[PDB]
Design an enzyme around this catalytic site. Structure first.
Site, PDB file in Angstrom:
ATOM      1  N   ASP A 142      30.312  36.612 -43.894  1.00 52.37           N
ATOM      2  CA  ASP A 142      28.877  36.575 -44.084  1.00 52.37           C
ATOM      3  C   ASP A 142      28.200  35.291 -43.628  1.00 52.37           C
ATOM      4  O   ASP A 142      27.255  34.849 -44.251  1.00 52.37           O
ATOM      5  CB  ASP A 142      28.518  36.894 -45.528  1.00 52.37           C
ATOM      6  CG  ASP A 142      27.073  37.269 -45.691  1.00 52.37           C
ATOM      7  OD1 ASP A 142      26.578  37.278 -46.823  1.00 52.37           O
ATOM      8  OD2 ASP A 142      26.420  37.551 -44.681  1.00 52.37           O
ATOM      9  N   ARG A 146      21.220  31.488 -43.889  1.00 54.78           N
ATOM     10  CA  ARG A 146      20.888  31.679 -45.303  1.00 54.78           C
ATOM     11  C   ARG A 146      22.061  31.231 -46.201  1.00 54.78           C
ATOM     12  O   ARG A 146      21.858  30.915 -47.371  1.00 54.78           O
ATOM     13  CB  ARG A 146      20.530  33.156 -45.592  1.00 54.78           C
ATOM     14  CG  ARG A 146      21.746  34.052 -45.844  1.00 54.78           C
ATOM     15  CD  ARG A 146      21.442  35.540 -46.060  1.00 54.78           C
ATOM     16  NE  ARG A 146      21.258  36.204 -44.780  1.00 54.78           N
ATOM     17  CZ  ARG A 146      22.186  36.901 -44.133  1.00 54.78           C
ATOM     18  NH1 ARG A 146      23.394  37.078 -44.644  1.00 54.78           N
ATOM     19  NH2 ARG A 146      21.888  37.430 -42.960  1.00 54.78           N
ATOM     20  N   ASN A 147      23.282  31.217 -45.659  1.00 60.09           N
ATOM     21  CA  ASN A 147      24.464  30.846 -46.441  1.00 60.09           C
ATOM     22  C   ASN A 147      25.024  29.478 -46.076  1.00 60.09           C
ATOM     23  O   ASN A 147      26.214  29.206 -46.245  1.00 60.09           O
ATOM     24  CB  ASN A 147      25.538  31.930 -46.355  1.00 60.09           C
ATOM     25  CG  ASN A 147      25.052  33.233 -46.928  1.00 60.09           C
ATOM     26  OD1 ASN A 147      24.259  33.222 -47.872  1.00 60.09           O
ATOM     27  ND2 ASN A 147      25.481  34.366 -46.352  1.00 60.09           N
ATOM     28  N   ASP A 160      28.259  30.966 -50.177  1.00 57.41           N
ATOM     29  CA  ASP A 160      28.270  32.423 -50.312  1.00 57.41           C
ATOM     30  C   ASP A 160      29.561  33.106 -49.906  1.00 57.41           C
ATOM     31  O   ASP A 160      29.649  33.717 -48.866  1.00 57.41           O
ATOM     32  CB  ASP A 160      27.092  33.068 -49.597  1.00 57.41           C
ATOM     33  CG  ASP A 160      26.762  34.444 -50.141  1.00 57.41           C
ATOM     34  OD1 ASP A 160      27.693  35.197 -50.464  1.00 57.41           O
ATOM     35  OD2 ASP A 160      25.570  34.777 -50.248  1.00 57.41           O
TER      36      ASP A 160
END
Lengths: 310, 7
Positions: A142, A146-147, A160
């Protein structure tokens, strides 16, 4: 051919940390900015504290604990460590406070004041984080802007680990089961066949760099995730960002090759970006670059978790 | 506006 995982999982008492403020809230729970004060140590550690809602399913707790398992096992400067967990009526996960937040948000908020030196350093640091995960035979599954979290403008860490999978020392691919998935960050092989690899993480790295280079744009914006796999088979990719020299963009493009083995290795991405980090203005063309500068609360006994070793 | 989609 796997070594025993002798990572320590530290269990924290609730009396050992004080919540200060609420960073965010969710049905899942609410995350708090706070301080961790280990018993009788004269130290305060800025932490983020995730307290789950008491209304949590045993399926939910099981998933979060696997994430903590992964987070506890990693030790690298560009990966977030789990400090510990608290086994209260509702489980609490304790991690290092990353004050400047999400890297996606940070570039969007600060797009005006971010120069080429920062952008290339971040690419280097993320490549190192991924290279490290690769060494630990881990597939993040992932990776995305955003992570990635910002400790400081100069230091960023991967985060994450909810989709992360360990790879058997023998095995090279992880075969998934159906789930909600970040389509627009995924290697084609992942989308078509639910196959994941370190090279499929390289694909996502590619997309993650593009997010940064476009100061937070949305990849394949306005085009439905259901049409992404066909576009990729047709040979279309994300466009060259305006600030990118062909050198940089060539590197992103290589990450998006159909033959996963033809994609670069994270150790190579480290090398090439740090070569460019040496002469940043040569590789990213940003208006007024040479002019830009990037940088709340009893701080006497305060220590960053990075300096708290056990 | 969802990053994650079923499939």
């Amino acid at each position: 051919g796997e070594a025993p995982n002798q990572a320590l999982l530290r269990i924290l008492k609730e009396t050992e940390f004080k919540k200060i403020k609420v960073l965010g809230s969710g049905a899942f729970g609410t995350v708090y900015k706070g301080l961790w004060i280990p018993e009788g140590e004269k130290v305060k550690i800025p932490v983020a504290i995730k307290e789950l809602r008491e209304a949590t399913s045993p399926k939910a707790n099981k998933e979060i604990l696997d994430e903590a398992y992964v987070m506890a096992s990693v030790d690298n400067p560009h990966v977030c460590r789990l400090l510990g967990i608290c086994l209260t009526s509702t489980v609490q996960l304790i991690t290092q406070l990353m004050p400047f937040g999400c890297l996606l948000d940070y570039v969007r908020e600060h797009k005006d004041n971010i120069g080429s030196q920062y952008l290339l350093n971040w690419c280097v640091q993320i490549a190192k984080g991924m290279n490290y995960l690769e060494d630990r035979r881990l597939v993040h599954r992932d990776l995305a802007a955003r992570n990635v979290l910002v400790k400081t403008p100069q230091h960023v860490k991967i985060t994450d680990f909810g989709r992360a999978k360990l790879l058997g020392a023998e095995e090279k691919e992880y075969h998934a089961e159906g789930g909600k998935v970040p389509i627009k960050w995924m290697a084609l092989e992942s989308i078509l066949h639910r196959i994941y690899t370190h090279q499929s993480d390289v694909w996502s790295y590619g997309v993650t760099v593009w997010e940064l280079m476009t100061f937070g744009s949305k990849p394949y914006d306005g085009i439905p995730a259901s049409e992404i796999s066909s576009i990729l088979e047709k040979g279309e990719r994300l466009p060259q960002p305006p600030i990118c020299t062909i050198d940089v963009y060539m590197i992103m493009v290589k990450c998006w090759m159909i033959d996963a083995d033809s994609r670069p290795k994270f150790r190579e991405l480290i090398i090439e970006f740090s070569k460019m980090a040496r002469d940043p203005q040569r590789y990213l063309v940003i208006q007024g670059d040479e002019r830009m500068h990037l940088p709340d609360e009893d701080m006497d006994d305060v220590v960053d978790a990075d300096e708290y070793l056990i | 506006d969802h990053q994650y989609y079923n499939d």
